[PDB]
Amino acid sequence: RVADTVGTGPTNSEAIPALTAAETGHTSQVVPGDTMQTRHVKNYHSRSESTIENFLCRSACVYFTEYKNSGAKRYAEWVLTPRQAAQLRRKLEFFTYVRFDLELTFVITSTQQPSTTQNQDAQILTHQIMYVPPGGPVPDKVDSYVWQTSTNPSVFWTEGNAPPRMSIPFLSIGNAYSNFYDGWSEFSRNGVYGINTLNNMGTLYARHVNAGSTGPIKSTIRIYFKPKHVKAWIPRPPRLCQYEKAKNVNFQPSGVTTTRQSITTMTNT
Amino acid sequence: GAQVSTQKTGAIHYTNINYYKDAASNSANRQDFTQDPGKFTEPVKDIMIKSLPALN
Amino acid sequence: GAQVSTQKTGAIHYTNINYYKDAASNSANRQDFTQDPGKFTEPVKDIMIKSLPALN
Amino acid sequence: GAQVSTQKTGAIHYTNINYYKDAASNSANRQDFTQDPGKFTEPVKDIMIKSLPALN
Amino acid sequence: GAQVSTQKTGAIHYTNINYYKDAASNSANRQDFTQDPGKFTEPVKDIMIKSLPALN
Amino acid sequence: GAQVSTQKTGAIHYTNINYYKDAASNSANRQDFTQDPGKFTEPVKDIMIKSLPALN
Amino acid sequence: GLPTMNTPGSCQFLTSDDFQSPSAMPQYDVTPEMRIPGEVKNLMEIAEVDSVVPVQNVGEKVNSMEAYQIPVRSNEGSGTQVFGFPLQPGYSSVFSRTLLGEILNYYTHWSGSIKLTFMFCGSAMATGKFLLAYSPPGAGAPTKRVDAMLGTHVIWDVGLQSSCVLCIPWISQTHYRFVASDEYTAGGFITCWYQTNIVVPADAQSSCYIMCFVSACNDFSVRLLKDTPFISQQNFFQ
Amino acid sequence: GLPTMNTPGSCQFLTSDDFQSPSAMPQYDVTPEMRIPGEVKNLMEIAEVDSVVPVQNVGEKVNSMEAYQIPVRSNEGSGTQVFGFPLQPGYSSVFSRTLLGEILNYYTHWSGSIKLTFMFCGSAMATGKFLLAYSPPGAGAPTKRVDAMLGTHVIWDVGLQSSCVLCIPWISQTHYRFVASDEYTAGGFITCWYQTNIVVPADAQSSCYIMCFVSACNDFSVRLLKDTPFISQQNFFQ
Amino acid sequence: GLPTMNTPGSCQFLTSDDFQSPSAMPQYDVTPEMRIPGEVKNLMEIAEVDSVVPVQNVGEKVNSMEAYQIPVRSNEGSGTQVFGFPLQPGYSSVFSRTLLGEILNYYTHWSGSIKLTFMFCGSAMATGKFLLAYSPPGAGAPTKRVDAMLGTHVIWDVGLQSSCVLCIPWISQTHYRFVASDEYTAGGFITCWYQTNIVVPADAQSSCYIMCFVSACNDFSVRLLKDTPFISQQNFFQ
């Protein structure tokens, strides 16, 4: 619930709530009443749909990969980072430090692949999405002992049902995820730059449980992240120039604004 | 117990019961209203009062 | 809380609990009975009483 | 409210709560026991008593 | 009403509410413990006491 | 009855009602916190006190 | 059995839903909490801070630090226009990349007053007065100071406290306005004119500068979230 | 697990359902409320207002302002019929496009009295009396005033207060009637006859007019909603 | 009917879920309970017990009982290094098969102090002093006793009570550390140097031994479970 205006009237005393240096790094609060006179206006506008959480808590697609059910890449693999989609990434990079839980929803959709195979009939492919914590074992062949899910979480989802959902709590070595890290991992200041171990929730692998149809089928796992219980500290400028890399802040210089005509033009080009 | 609170109205009541062991699986805190712009705005040591000039 | 109200009978009781955060997602207000035809009908300044002619 | 009534036993208790706005959408009244054969049987004006003949 | 009774433990509590009109549609009475072997075993007229021979 | 207990928080409340006859079908006891390392560690007859040497 | 009939709405996934969930590893003990300085709890904390407006644009006054400075010079005839831009944040190419405007492009609606602090960064002996005027939409922007006066103006007299806040009040026929361009609602014109020409003694540079800052008021609110248009991608970042 | 067995009725979408729902953008703050004049809360607010009945029809008395006026003229023999139409709103081609009838075509049932206000818009010296009669169905409409009398009539004597309300009462064998044509139920006949011929002095026009107005009473109710037949479309409006 | 809409999350099977269930044979009476000695209720009961560390490795000092013994001999120059290994359990090839490390490979995080009990199993007339030092990461391990001193050390004077506990305290910039190798966090270096050379009389063997034991403290906790990498299978065990 926002603030309200109140009646003022003429002003001829030495108050000048307008004139004040902004050289002191102090952003002054000036109301309508200070530059004119405005009667008592009640405002019922609500500054809710602008809260830190509600802003960030929207499911954004972070990635999607493809994996053949019969051929070579029968599994996909992804190192979890929100740095693969421009949309979600820019929202997170509006804060230096963020803390949150994740809701991972996977929208797996299958598409038949053109082939000359006879009598292709699917018997409802079942997909396995498996979470491998950081420093886990790494599957190779899709039949490896790794897929036994001995302790590693996994969602088993039969196709044609509500998409799988699971939560992850806040998992960070530190007490907040750093969205910007200035420093190296190595004491000699070489190697990787800002590839700190705090935003590295291991890998997520996915594959077809069954052998599907006789023919080839390619499935597309689409990953959705939704930040719940968000707390965000230290605000910072939104990114201007386009992203170039998924782990660096590399950029090509570009405009400071969109151009127009003169300084006194009243219409954008 | 059942937590009953008003729906976000412009200008009522919904039961909600947490059903999971972890507290990291509860629904988002969409309602959580606070504002305190005395931080980033006006971070100065001695607050400038609106009735005289900041500098001498 | 549970809002209990009579079913619309011609000539009983149903629990209903709002389960969503917004109040713009609650079921329609099908029951909401009011009538007040003193608006569009008879909008005249001085009400004409039924016992004499409106004009002199 | 929850209406609790005995299950139809030969020789117990079930909650039932109406969930719909209309009262024409409630479950059938399968239990509704009444008998009153003084209608179609013996519709005569003056009841014939079983101890003498109906006619004189 | 809700019937609460201990789960069959070796060496707790479950709500159960009948939801159907008939009492022939309620869940089985798996818990129903009684034993009384004075029937098929020892059906004799005069109970033989264990301290002397049955016959003279 | 409904067993209400705090969600495992780092630094709230969930109803849970057992619905099955057996007590071998209830959800795991994930919360069950106890520690007592006076077993495998320090199994000695006479506890060695930390202020002098164990041997003479 | 507890009879239920699934209402349509089930078996879908929204991209803005909110529900309970099953956990992954259960009983995980979350790390402690630190009270790290400068906590943010609302976007209006960020939006009420000044950001330099790159008012000047030409074609290479948009690739340097020339963008942010508004050229002011002594011109003998007074009534010359210093600058002029419409108030239509999150569409106007003057506020499209400012801090206020960039938060605004994630919202479809906005309401509230906006403060334009003009800071004179001239010499310390240079003087001048400016008539800063905001003329609501009702006509197509003043082209003379004598027309600009009629609006809501503030004459800024310079000399210590090198900034003066022209606060633009809410004048709209609705309780919100669009961030994206529309013609049912518009935001008028913000202009500056010389009130009394820049008088600069000898040995002091006769070309000074002004800086424009855009900030939100405390009667400010944004409603209905959408997603920005000023960010893009082609293929995934490898 | 809480045992449930889905009763048939689930996984369907009706076009008249009503349930809780998931929201789109959650926590959206709806705009304030204004008390704009003339709030409507029931369709009977609208239905109880007079609307001019286009009683006259021929073939070009249905494309002009000739439709609404009922020609009245002085005829020497009295017992001539002024007009006549059945009462069967939302089917009758006299009430098919009136305000009452158009609300009525969205309903299958209707019950209540109906008021027919006849307003004499003749000269200010013209006189005349009319026997306005409503004869319930029991026979096939009067063809003489001497037969029309027997019904429920109201003799209207003109002379100041240029309107007279013939209120048609509810006479039906059921507590509702169909809006659409049926023959189990019917609504009778509304006729008007001259009681005493139009006497008009000199220099005053001898052809006057009457206007018929249709309104609902306060003992009026409509039940069971359907959708109109008097609106149509082919391809979507491009 | 009780309206419900299935939220996405239904019709899946996790490998870490927990729910109510239907039973198989209902009313089965579970066997009694015995209080068999040595009940375990937490993994920290097992992890706080000493286990011999196989510090020595070469290529055949990893297939015998030579692995567990750390060779100590009298060398005339003092400042010689006895052993040296990093502290990074569950990755380091010194703690990879110990009791502490093997519990640790089922977890991704660990926090808490670690106790290294060194037990002198020399002659009963042999003496010697050792400077056991733990130098946090800040540089790349001491190569002299004069550099090792600066760290957190404990000079062990032998002579009755043939063990001395060098307790490594928690020095980390985070409240947990990875079990798997990482370079954002590291665990420093544990070294041992001769403080005063092994003095052994006549007729007593001049080569003694030390044993290293690894145990967890009571300020120890592990978080976030994963599954080991040190176990494998090919085809099922027939």
Ligand SMILES: O=C(O)c1ccc(NS(=O)(=O)c2ccc(N3C(=O)c4ccccc4C3=O)cc2)cc1
């Ligand atoms: O999914 C996993 O959990 C799982 C899959 C592969 C795996 N890796 S393995 O230990 O190399 C392994 C590899 C193959 C089989 N395996 C066979 O070779 C076979 C032949 C015929 C019938 C069944 C099976 C069968 O299981 C079993 C184990 C472990 C677990």
